Design an enzyme around this catalytic site. Structure first.
Site, PDB file in Angstrom:
ATOM      1  N   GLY A 181       0.788  -1.217   0.000  1.00  0.00           N
ATOM      2  CA  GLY A 181       0.000   0.000   0.000  1.00  0.00           C
ATOM      3  C   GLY A 181       0.824   1.272   0.000  1.00  0.00           C
ATOM      4  O   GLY A 181       0.305   2.336  -0.343  1.00  0.00           O
ATOM      5  N   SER A 182       2.090   1.197   0.399  1.00  0.00           N
ATOM      6  CA  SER A 182       2.953   2.368   0.401  1.00  0.00           C
ATOM      7  C   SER A 182       3.706   2.528  -0.916  1.00  0.00           C
ATOM      8  O   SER A 182       4.582   3.392  -1.014  1.00  0.00           O
ATOM      9  CB  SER A 182       3.928   2.296   1.588  1.00  0.00           C
ATOM     10  OG  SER A 182       3.238   2.486   2.826  1.00  0.00           O
ATOM     11  N   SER A 224       6.015   4.469   4.726  1.00  0.00           N
ATOM     12  CA  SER A 224       5.770   3.303   5.569  1.00  0.00           C
ATOM     13  C   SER A 224       4.855   3.710   6.710  1.00  0.00           C
ATOM     14  O   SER A 224       5.262   4.485   7.580  1.00  0.00           O
ATOM     15  CB  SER A 224       7.080   2.732   6.106  1.00  0.00           C
ATOM     16  OG  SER A 224       6.811   1.652   6.983  1.00  0.00           O
ATOM     17  N   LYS A 225       3.644   3.154   6.715  1.00  0.00           N
ATOM     18  CA  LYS A 225       2.707   3.397   7.806  1.00  0.00           C
ATOM     19  C   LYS A 225       3.341   3.100   9.163  1.00  0.00           C
ATOM     20  O   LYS A 225       3.341   3.951  10.059  1.00  0.00           O
ATOM     21  CB  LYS A 225       1.451   2.555   7.591  1.00  0.00           C
ATOM     22  CG  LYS A 225       0.388   2.731   8.671  1.00  0.00           C
ATOM     23  CD  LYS A 225      -0.878   1.957   8.313  1.00  0.00           C
ATOM     24  CE  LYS A 225      -1.993   2.221   9.326  1.00  0.00           C
ATOM     25  NZ  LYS A 225      -3.265   1.492   8.960  1.00  0.00           N
ATOM     26  N   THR A 226       3.908   1.902   9.323  1.00  0.00           N
ATOM     27  CA  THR A 226       4.518   1.522  10.594  1.00  0.00           C
ATOM     28  C   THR A 226       5.927   2.079  10.764  1.00  0.00           C
ATOM     29  O   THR A 226       6.387   2.262  11.898  1.00  0.00           O
ATOM     30  CB  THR A 226       4.577  -0.001  10.703  1.00  0.00           C
ATOM     31  OG1 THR A 226       5.309  -0.521   9.580  1.00  0.00           O
ATOM     32  CG2 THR A 226       3.171  -0.591  10.715  1.00  0.00           C
ATOM     33  N   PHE A 227       6.628   2.316   9.658  1.00  0.00           N
ATOM     34  CA  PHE A 227       8.062   2.612   9.652  1.00  0.00           C
ATOM     35  C   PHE A 227       8.887   1.505  10.302  1.00  0.00           C
ATOM     36  O   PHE A 227       9.983   1.757  10.811  1.00  0.00           O
ATOM     37  CB  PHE A 227       8.379   3.968  10.296  1.00  0.00           C
ATOM     38  CG  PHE A 227       9.347   4.779   9.482  1.00  0.00           C
ATOM     39  CD1 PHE A 227       8.920   5.414   8.330  1.00  0.00           C
ATOM     40  CD2 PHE A 227      10.689   4.845   9.822  1.00  0.00           C
ATOM     41  CE1 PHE A 227       9.802   6.142   7.552  1.00  0.00           C
ATOM     42  CE2 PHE A 227      11.577   5.563   9.043  1.00  0.00           C
ATOM     43  CZ  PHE A 227      11.130   6.214   7.904  1.00  0.00           C
ATOM     44  N   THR A 228       8.393   0.264  10.254  1.00  0.00           N
ATOM     45  CA  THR A 228       9.169  -0.888  10.699  1.00  0.00           C
ATOM     46  C   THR A 228       9.261  -2.008   9.668  1.00  0.00           C
ATOM     47  O   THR A 228       9.953  -3.002   9.924  1.00  0.00           O
ATOM     48  CB  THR A 228       8.584  -1.466  11.995  1.00  0.00           C
ATOM     49  OG1 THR A 228       7.242  -1.908  11.755  1.00  0.00           O
ATOM     50  CG2 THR A 228       8.589  -0.418  13.087  1.00  0.00           C
ATOM     51  N   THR A 229       8.593  -1.883   8.523  1.00  0.00           N
ATOM     52  CA  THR A 229       8.571  -2.964   7.547  1.00  0.00           C
ATOM     53  C   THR A 229       9.983  -3.320   7.096  1.00  0.00           C
ATOM     54  O   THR A 229      10.765  -2.441   6.727  1.00  0.00           O
ATOM     55  CB  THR A 229       7.721  -2.555   6.344  1.00  0.00           C
ATOM     56  OG1 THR A 229       6.400  -2.216   6.788  1.00  0.00           O
ATOM     57  CG2 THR A 229       7.640  -3.692   5.327  1.00  0.00           C
ATOM     58  N   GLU A 255      11.398  -4.847   4.420  1.00  0.00           N
ATOM     59  CA  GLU A 255      11.869  -4.465   3.091  1.00  0.00           C
ATOM     60  C   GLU A 255      12.122  -2.970   3.011  1.00  0.00           C
ATOM     61  O   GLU A 255      13.144  -2.533   2.470  1.00  0.00           O
ATOM     62  CB  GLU A 255      10.859  -4.868   2.010  1.00  0.00           C
ATOM     63  CG  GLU A 255      10.677  -6.359   1.818  1.00  0.00           C
ATOM     64  CD  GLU A 255       9.409  -6.870   2.441  1.00  0.00           C
ATOM     65  OE1 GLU A 255       9.012  -6.331   3.488  1.00  0.00           O
ATOM     66  OE2 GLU A 255       8.804  -7.796   1.876  1.00  0.00           O
ATOM     67  N   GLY A 261      -3.398   0.683   4.183  1.00  0.00           N
ATOM     68  CA  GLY A 261      -2.401   0.879   3.135  1.00  0.00           C
ATOM     69  C   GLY A 261      -2.989   0.886   1.733  1.00  0.00           C
ATOM     70  O   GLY A 261      -2.633   1.730   0.903  1.00  0.00           O
ATOM     71  N   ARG A 262      -3.898  -0.048   1.445  1.00  0.00           N
ATOM     72  CA  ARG A 262      -4.500  -0.143   0.115  1.00  0.00           C
ATOM     73  C   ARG A 262      -5.527   0.961  -0.146  1.00  0.00           C
ATOM     74  O   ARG A 262      -6.091   1.019  -1.250  1.00  0.00           O
ATOM     75  CB  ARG A 262      -5.126  -1.528  -0.070  1.00  0.00           C
ATOM     76  CG  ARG A 262      -6.277  -1.840   0.883  1.00  0.00           C
ATOM     77  CD  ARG A 262      -6.646  -3.320   0.796  1.00  0.00           C
ATOM     78  NE  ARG A 262      -7.532  -3.746   1.874  1.00  0.00           N
ATOM     79  CZ  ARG A 262      -7.106  -4.250   3.028  1.00  0.00           C
ATOM     80  NH1 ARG A 262      -5.814  -4.320   3.317  1.00  0.00           N
ATOM     81  NH2 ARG A 262      -7.999  -4.690   3.915  1.00  0.00           N
ATOM     82  N   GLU A 309      -7.016  -8.032  -1.369  1.00  0.00           N
ATOM     83  CA  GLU A 309      -6.562  -7.896   0.010  1.00  0.00           C
ATOM     84  C   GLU A 309      -7.706  -7.493   0.934  1.00  0.00           C
ATOM     85  O   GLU A 309      -7.717  -7.871   2.113  1.00  0.00           O
ATOM     86  CB  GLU A 309      -5.422  -6.886   0.092  1.00  0.00           C
ATOM     87  CG  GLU A 309      -4.688  -6.903   1.424  1.00  0.00           C
ATOM     88  CD  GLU A 309      -3.669  -5.793   1.531  1.00  0.00           C
ATOM     89  OE1 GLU A 309      -3.540  -5.005   0.570  1.00  0.00           O
ATOM     90  OE2 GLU A 309      -3.013  -5.689   2.583  1.00  0.00           O
ATOM     91  N   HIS A 346      -5.253  -9.132 -28.038  1.00  0.00           N
ATOM     92  CA  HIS A 346      -4.386  -9.970 -28.847  1.00  0.00           C
ATOM     93  C   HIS A 346      -3.849 -11.148 -28.068  1.00  0.00           C
ATOM     94  O   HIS A 346      -3.155 -11.993 -28.639  1.00  0.00           O
ATOM     95  CB  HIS A 346      -3.239  -9.126 -29.406  1.00  0.00           C
ATOM     96  CG  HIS A 346      -3.699  -8.074 -30.361  1.00  0.00           C
ATOM     97  ND1 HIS A 346      -3.639  -8.233 -31.729  1.00  0.00           N
ATOM     98  CD2 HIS A 346      -4.269  -6.863 -30.145  1.00  0.00           C
ATOM     99  CE1 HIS A 346      -4.127  -7.153 -32.315  1.00  0.00           C
ATOM    100  NE2 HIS A 346      -4.523  -6.308 -31.377  1.00  0.00           N
ATOM    101  N   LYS A 397       4.746 -10.535   7.122  1.00  0.00           N
ATOM    102  CA  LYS A 397       5.779  -9.629   7.591  1.00  0.00           C
ATOM    103  C   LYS A 397       6.535 -10.163   8.801  1.00  0.00           C
ATOM    104  O   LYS A 397       7.523  -9.543   9.210  1.00  0.00           O
ATOM    105  CB  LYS A 397       5.154  -8.263   7.895  1.00  0.00           C
ATOM    106  CG  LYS A 397       4.541  -7.629   6.660  1.00  0.00           C
ATOM    107  CD  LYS A 397       3.550  -6.519   6.996  1.00  0.00           C
ATOM    108  CE  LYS A 397       4.234  -5.182   7.053  1.00  0.00           C
ATOM    109  NZ  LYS A 397       3.231  -4.082   7.061  1.00  0.00           N
TER     110      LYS A 397
END
Ligand SMILES: O=C(O)[C@@H](O)[C@H](O)[C@H](O)COP(=O)(O)O
Ligand SMILES: O=C(O)[C@@H](O)[C@H](O)[C@H](O)COP(=O)(O)O
Ligand SMILES: Oc1cccc2nccnc12
Ligand SMILES: Oc1cccc2nccnc12
Lengths: 550, 550
Positions: free
Chosen positions: A163-164, A214-219, A221, A276-277, A362, A393, A515
């Site tokens: 989502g980010s 980053s919503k959490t700022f901990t992800t 990746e 996020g989405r 999701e 096609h 995650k």
């Protein structure tokens, strides 16, 4: 708490099962038009946006008639779609499993209506972030925000995933006609080091701005990618004091942003009630505001807001996103079609199906209802697509002649941002839009194949059943406002599906699990010793990898 | 002619339905590993490529055991998969409805085996085109082929659609690590004028080479796009004599190539027995040879050739593409799963699912068998996908917790072309590959959710069923040879599916129809007069468009 347990508990569900057997399964769209000279008028709706532009939603080639639609509307009433919708707009914590409000509609509240969470109006707090976004994006675009050697910014790199990431990607692509030469946007999302290396290889640290989204700022990746970008920046810029001119954060977690080394003045905040989405409308959309200007971004929000007001105030039988959601339930749960195809006749919208695939799957890929019991029926559909005319096609072969019902949405703008050769390409594009939905409906029977010259065993191979359903969405032009309304249409279609199935469209415990899954095996990849801590396949794969890795 | 009429006529078909009811529907993969200490060994195969590199195909997390696989192999014997395969390799006209050979395998015949069509060996004709491709691509890459002002070529633009586009796109993306700075490839495919305008906006006519890619050289989008590129070129170059240094053709139709104004010396030919979705191995791959060099393109062909020889010479029970096709039939026709997910854990492969979606769905989206009767069972699956780890943050929610069985292929290279930070990103990427397939198999039951702290109604929302199947494909490295083998694996998996269903995997009467549908409406868009020549929906859409167009 829920007012019913399962969608199959709603009395209209078994009535729809009876109607499917008697009328629906063998529905002839050709016969429907022949019986009803006003069918196009009755099953198409014109949406009028806040700026007086228009979008035509034509559902009349679907396997639906007055009886079927009336029963689907009754089902929506029994399911309390309107009650749950009103609760969403009231700020109630309808995300029951995380105990959160669901308030993306508050992000585009440009009218500054009172929209409270926990009894406190959100309007000013949302507006204040947008004002920060306007000030910052204006300063990037007019060159007054300079890098550490005093140069204007030429490249903006969003770093985030899920989502980010996908909203920023899809919307900057969709509205690329509104960008300006010399100011480019890029995206790093995959943990795969290829994404970092290829994106940064030709960029200048002196003129590149990073947005860590980053919503959490901990992800894992995103923080790992952000660290790699910081290392890349410091390899040239040397001193960490320069980070404040080149790194900003889009997040809910100020403490983690500051601990990462980003100035709080460079943080663009949002709240837990932004999924996020559903987040491109928030600070997460900052790359959009930079790429096309804040005023275009604001028009994008206002298009969503206008569709929100349509969804909130329109009786179900004329409520465009509700109608789209009801047809999805009809196909998913009574015809048994597992997929939903979205085809933009528009190259700028090439990432629109991927974005909707996240929004839809999701949200509605769930097996437990709001009564906390398992479903005994199908929930979320598998959504997919590619732009036309390319799709015509390739996999359109199966759409036309395969054995699977694939409800499809076709989207076309009447006016192109690139009307080259006095609209020669655009008229051709449009003719394919009309002709493909026509052919899916009318088909081509045995007699016509014979009249066209086929004989003997070749004949059946060239037949087309027809009665393959489509929805046609014709916009005047894909402006920011139009795209805002189109995304919100699919947001509220997705809402309607989930409300009927009685699921929570707003959590994602499978994404949350993902995650936390990899850490255990990541530690095992720190050496080359054979592992036997898992099932034999996981062990065998890990051990073969250890033999083959660097 | 066909040896049987319908797949349901094969005696093993009803045996498989009995096995599905008794052990398939409720198959426990966890129990299967517990029952069988050698399961990973028994249901994984190492493929050895011509260059001694390797690919591990691990099918052991699928809903399959010895009994089920033995019956699927028996079904393949009854269906004559081997007879039809051998006829394909013999040059027989197994594309019955167009009366054509199906001979993409002859394109990668670098061994120069005798491979005849109509009794005449094709080896040297194919080899001669490859020699021309090598000579031309070498001259572009070393700078000896100059544009009309004497400058070396910096940009190559492929113009084509469908099979004449998506292979070149996917393969140049997948093998981008093998390209050189300063020589870039671009693609125009959509008739949407946006595609032409955006691709050419920053290119220099003096240093741009066009490849017009079209089997027929009559496709409306491609010829219209090619004309627009010629107009763009001549707006700067003025003189049509300069076209001979900037336009080449990849085609079967020399007369139409010359009539368009391209010199026959600049034509790279192929034959009618190359299907578009199987054509990247032919002259259509010229953009690949230019982008990464002919030797890398040749290694790509040799990887396909090695997988061809595996498919041709291996008994069914150890034949890797056959096994993949048999599992697809098992899920499609006995579990009723309508989709097939392909997830590359590899950013370079981001267009790999879209390419396979064309290959698979256009081949097997058919409702008529080789006995020229309509099927009474499901044929082609709906194939989709996005790269990981991104997909883990989006629609993997539904894969993990939704109500639809989604057989999935995960693909990972053990070694990255971009092993940044001493492979820190690569180890993280890999750990997600292993952990995701593990979690889909093992799930998380009620007791574990409770032990992790959930109580009451939250518990079911956090459960995972497990027993959700995956196939894991672990390569050493995505080299050209590895990519060649991987595409050929999916080509022959697709072959196996179609042979069991008894369909013609090699025609496409729905995309042939699409290429003749739009002309009638195109003529109607030449004025603003209201139309009444169609059904009411098609009329209403056309007339609304006429009111809204520029
Ligand atoms: O839909 C989701 O919740 C995910 O795709 C997240 O957006 C993704 O995991 C990134 O999470 P975050 O924004 O906290 O970094
Ligand atoms: O699969 C197909 O046959 C199509 O996608 C074709 O490749 C596409 O229509 C282009 O045809 P042509 O190569 O003749 O221009
Ligand atoms: O560590 C890195 C960080 C960023 C970009 C890189 N590009 C190539 C190699 N390493 C890199
Ligand atoms: O006619 C055209 C041909 C090619 C490129 C173009 N770009 C902008 C406008 N017209 C164009």
């Amino acid at each position: 708490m829920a007012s019913f347990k399962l969608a199959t508990d709603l009395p209209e569900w078994k009535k729809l099962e009876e109607t499917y057997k008697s009328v629906g399964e063998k529905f002839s769209v050709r016969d429907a038009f022949a019986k009803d000279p006003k069918r196009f008028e009755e099953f198409s709706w014109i949406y009028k946006n806040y700026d007086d532009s228009k979008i035509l939603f034509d559902f009349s080639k679907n396997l639906v008639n007055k009886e079927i639609l009336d029963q689907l509307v009754t089902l929506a009433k029994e399911a309390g779609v309107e009650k749950l919708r009103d609760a969403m707009f009231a700020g109630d914590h309808i995300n029951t499993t995380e105990d959160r409000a669901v308030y993306h509609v508050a992000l585009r509240n440009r009218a500054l209506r009172k929209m409270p969470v926990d009894g406190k109006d959100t309007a000013q707090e949302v507006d204040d972030v947008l004002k920060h976004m306007k000030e910052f994006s204006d300063s990037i675009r007019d060159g007054s925000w300079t890098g550490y050697t005093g140069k204007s910014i030429t490249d903006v790199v969003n770093i985030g995933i899920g989502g980010s990431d996908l909203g920023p990607v899809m919307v900057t692509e969709a509205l690329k006609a509104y960008s300006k030469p010399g100011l480019n946007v890029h995206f790093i999302s995959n943990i795969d080091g290829t994404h970092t290396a290829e994106t940064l290889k030709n960029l200048n640290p002196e003129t590149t701005l990073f947005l860590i989204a980053s919503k959490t700022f901990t992800t894992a990746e995103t923080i790992t990618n952000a660290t790699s970008a910081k290392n890349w920046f410091l390899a040239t810029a040397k001193d960490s004091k320069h980070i404040a001119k080149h790194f900003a954060a889009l997040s809910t977690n100020e403490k983690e942003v500051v601990a990462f080394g980003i100035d709080a003045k460079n943080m663009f905040g949002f709240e837990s009630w932004v999924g996020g989405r559903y987040s491109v409308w928030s600070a997460i959309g900052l790359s959009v505001a930079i790429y096309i200007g804040f005023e275009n971004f604001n028009d994008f929000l206002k298009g969503a807001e206008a569709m929100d007001q349509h969804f909130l105030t329109t009786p179900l039988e004329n409520n465009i996103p509700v109608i789209g959601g009801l047809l999805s339930v009809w196909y998913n749960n009574f015809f048994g079609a597992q997929t939903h195809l979205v085809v933009p006749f528009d190259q700028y919208l090439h990432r629109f199906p991927a974005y909707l695939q996240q929004l839809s799957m999701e949200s509605n890929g769930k097996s437990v209802t709001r009564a906390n019991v398992f479903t005994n029926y199908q929930t979320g559909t598998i959504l997919f697509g590619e732009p036309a005319t390319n799709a015509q096609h390739s996999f359109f072969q199966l759409v036309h002649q395969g054995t699977k019902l694939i409800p499809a949405d076709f989207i076309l703008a009447a006016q192109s941002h690139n009307p080259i050769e006095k609209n020669l390409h655009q008229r051709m594009l449009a003719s394919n839009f009309f002709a493909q939905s026509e052919a899916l409906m009318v088909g081509k029977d045995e007699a016509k194949v014979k009249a066209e010259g086929a004989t003997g065993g070749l004949v059946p191979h060239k037949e087309f059943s027809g009665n393959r359903p489509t929805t046609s969405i014709l916009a005047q032009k894909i402006t920011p406002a139009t795209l805002g309304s189109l995304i919100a249409y699919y947001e509220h279609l997705t809402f309607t599906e989930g409300a009927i199935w009685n699921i929570n469209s707003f959590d994602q415990w499978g994404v949350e699990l993902g995650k936390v899954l990899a850490k255990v095996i990541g530690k095992e990849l720190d050496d080359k010793k054979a592992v036997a801590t898992h099932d034999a396949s996981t062990n065998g794969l890990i051990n073969q990898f250890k033999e083959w890795e660097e």
